[PDB]
Design a protein around this ligand. Structure first.
Ligand code: GDP
Ligand code: GDP
Lengths: 78, 369, 110, 369
């Protein structure tokens, strides 16, 4: 999917997304109170949006991929 | 990233010695701890060769083996002696830690039945105290006997960040069926095949699964559900393998559904059909799963030792393991009515009951919250 | 539908799916069932080449109104079928699909 | 879908053993249950090859046969002994059912003339208890014999989902005509040919009739009228076979009218002239049909086994079958006036009277209500 622009420009957003989240958990050792929770709910509104956004994209080669993510039909409930 | 092993009690020391036997023979390392002439990255389990083992009557039998160059019964009786020689053994661990480049985990091999039960309980607490940054995987073995087992659980439920179960009663049944033994030295042979195959992807260089964290992190979703069970088919396409794994006659255990599944393929199978087997397997809907959490089935390839045909092992985190705990708790309650404070057993009785509920609650459509 | 043995199993597996409306239907799911159906019947003992072309297509309600097989053919053999035989077979396949579910309904009532 | 067969009593074992011999030779299966080298769908009746049989002295002579590698006299005595081993024989069936992919039905081969007949009546009821959604077709065979015959009739009229009658008096006359025998092993040759031919469209798949309910759903109009009779043309155009089956000197049965007819032509006949013949047979009016509802005649082709010419098989539903019950009925009354409650005989005598009353009223222009 390196040449397929739409998927490569959507998963890319998922890539740097985890950098922010993983840093958020590592940049402290206490509960998410000092505007961390305020920053936490920011990404889920975009991530889960980016999550189901990808879901419509796959609905030739994606059959081998979407099968693994959909083994428990969880995205079917999304 | 190196991982050191710890062997306690009779069972632990016996299987670990054999665990190395299968391991050293898997590589070209003669019993006298030297490479034979006759690829396989050996950094995780060997130092330059010498294995990173820490062993604790039976040592005479091992020192009399050709491998001389390769290096009470109550829970209260075991825990008491361990505190006395605390600083004695922790010298060994410390000197082995800094001698290692970057220590990663602590494999523990012991039986929950007697000195290994208490000493292991003492270790796990102290190990977490000094080292809070180290994974702790344990190869515990299941069978006054019930009291020793329940006390270990209280420690294993919160200290060990990972765990595998190996029950003898189920293992012994495999012996009379397919091996016709009626012997510990024989039933242990399967354990070595189980243990060695459990960590195949760590020694052979691959794309992923290059660390113990790379394996367990997929299975355990929450630090409360940190128990696994095993499966091993060869006792020949990939579909032939995955089908024979999920049969209840092969697993090593004595509504309910899986949480995550790992598949270890040690053969030379053609990797183009592997995604096809999952398709057909998913359609057959041969195995049920949780409805709350999105997960899948993990499959990973490997290569068999050329110095030694397709095998296969499966790692399972099944909520049916809660049934086993009930038997221990059910028996103990019978003992509590059959006969310095006797409250430590009572607190553990509570904390083990919590784990049974957590599994039972996990099979619900609304386990979360 | 000249096989009969394969279409029998294929109508038992698509029953839980096609009862839902077409909006929740996605092609990526039905193929898995189709591959399993060939194995579950006598159609497994067959030339692998012709089995590579047999797939599903989604006509564009209910799941029993948009499902149909395609069997696409390209290359030299495509000069015998010429995009019109494939626009006629599908025109036939509907009448053989309806007259096949109207029978498995009437053997369920019985 | 699969179909499990049962063999009860001396007759069931013999005609079932001869059914499997013919069915093994019809396919490419050596007596050692191994496939020889030498299209035919054989998954329904064979398990990957193992027959799906449940056999119930005669067993020894079967085990001394070259096919060993292929696996009192009252009705009350035959009913009770089945109750004491109720749990026993079902474990064999319960494992075969769940071991089966998707069960469809239960073929029963038994003679109603006495331990086997009594055991059959018991098992026919319990299958209705456990499995509600499985067809039960019975290849019963007609002959204190009047007593046992009517009792099993009480169960065969409300338990068995279909029934194919085969009376010895019609088969023995056929053996003393074209066979010229003056033995049990001789008439069973004909019974095996009818049984093997009955399920021909199941093993060789065609455009239609790929399931057991497909053959039955056309003939049996209401759940009460579930009795059938057979016809073998040989003991060539398709117009000859049809006119050689409708004859009353070929039926295996010792006003009235037909309800539905099914014809099985197993030859290499020309399949284009089959629709022509049904156009002519209607004109000669060789058979009289029901006046209330519409009825027709059905012809289905197949392919003979190449490893072993035109043959035929006619399954019909004629109300003249009511006469056979009348003979057993009248024979019962004569013994009832000649010699803990003897009330079951009263209920059985009553319920079969309703079945006979259905037939004689099934031939009227107002069978509706
Ligand atoms: N499966 C298996 N279990 C063993 C073996 N050796 C010991 N055990 C278990 O270890 C328990 C006894 O341990 P024990 O000898 O009292 O340990 P110790 O007190 O430290 O010497 C028993 O319940 C056995 O089930 C072995 O070779 N195989
Ligand atoms: N059609 C047919 N009927 C048979 C055959 N062998 C036995 N029978 C019938 O079975 C009845 C005898 O049953 P029997 O074997 O004594 O019952 P059991 O002693 O309880 O097994 C007779 O009335 C026969 O009509 C056979 O080969 N073919």
């Amino acid at each position: 999917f390196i040449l397929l622009k739409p998927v490569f420009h959507c998963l890319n957003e998922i890539l740097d997304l985890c950098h922010s989240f993983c840093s958020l958990v590592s940049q402290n050792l206490g509960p998410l109170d000092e505007r961390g929770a305020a920053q936490l709910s920011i990404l889920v509104k975009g991530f889960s949006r980016q999550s189901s956004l990808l879901f419509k994209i796959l609905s030739n080669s994606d059959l081998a991929q979407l099968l693994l993510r959909l083994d428990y039909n969880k995205y079917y409930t999304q | 990233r190196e991982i050191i092993t710890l062997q306690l009690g009779q069972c632990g020391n016996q299987i670990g010695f054999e665990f190395w036997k299968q391991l050293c023979a898997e590589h070209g390392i003669s019993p006298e701890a030297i490479v034979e002439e006759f690829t396989d990255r050996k950094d995780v389990f060997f130092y330059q060769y010498i294995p990173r083992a820490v062993l604790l009557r039976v040592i005479h039998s091992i020192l009399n083996s050709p491998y001389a160059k390769l290096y009470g019964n109550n829970w209260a009786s075991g825990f008491s002696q361990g505190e006395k020689i605390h600083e004695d053994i922790f010298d060994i661990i410390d000197r082995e830690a800094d001698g290692s480049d970057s220590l990663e985990g602590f494999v523990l091999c012991h039986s929950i039945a007697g000195t290994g039960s208490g000493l292991g309980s003492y270790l796990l607490e102290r190990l977490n105290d000094r080292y809070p940054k180290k994974l702790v995987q344990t190869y515990s073995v299941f069978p006054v006997q019930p009291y020793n087992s329940l006390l270990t659980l209280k420690r294993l439920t919160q200290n060990a960040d990972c765990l595998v179960v190996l029950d003898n009663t189920a293992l012994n049944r495999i012996a009379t069926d397919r091996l016709h033994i009626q012997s510990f030295s024989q039933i242990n042979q399967l354990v070595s095949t189980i243990m060695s195959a459990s960590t195949t992807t760590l020694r052979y260089p691959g794309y992923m699964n290059n660390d113990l964290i790379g394996l367990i992190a997929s299975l355990i979703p929450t630090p409360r559900l940190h128990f696994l069970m095993t499966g091993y088919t060869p006792l020949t396409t990939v579909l032939d393998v995955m089908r024979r794994l999920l049969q209840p006659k092969n697993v090593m255990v004595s509504n309910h559904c899986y949480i995550a599944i790992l598949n270890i393929i040690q053969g030379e199978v053609d990797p183009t059909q592997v995604h096809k087997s999952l398709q057909r397997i998913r359609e057959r809907k041969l195995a049920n799963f949780i409805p709350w959490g999105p997960a899948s089935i993990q499959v990973a390839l490997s290569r068999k030792s050329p110095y030694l045909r397709v095998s296969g092992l499966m790692m399972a985190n099944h909520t049916s393991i809660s049934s086993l705990f009930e038997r221990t708790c059910r028996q103990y309650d019978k003992l509590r009515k059959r006969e310095d404070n006797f409250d430590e057993m009572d607190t553990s009785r509570e904390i083990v009951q919590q784990l049974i509920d957590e599994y039972h609650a996990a099979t619900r459509p609304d386990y979360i919250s | 539908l000249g096989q009969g043995d394969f279409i029998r199993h294929l109508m038992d597996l698509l029953k839980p799916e096609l009862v839902r409306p077409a909006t929740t239907l996605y092609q990526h799911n039905l193929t898995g069932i189709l591959e399993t159906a060939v194995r579950a019947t006598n159609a497994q003992f067959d030339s692998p080449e012709i089995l590579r072309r047999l797939d599903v297509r989604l006509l564009e309600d209910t799941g029993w109104d948009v499902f149909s097989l395609d069997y696409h053919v390209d290359g030299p053999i495509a000069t015998v079928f010429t995009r019109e035989c494939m626009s006629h077979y599908l025109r036939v396949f509907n009448f053989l699909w309806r007259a096949k579910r109207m029978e498995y309904i009437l053997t369920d009532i019985r």
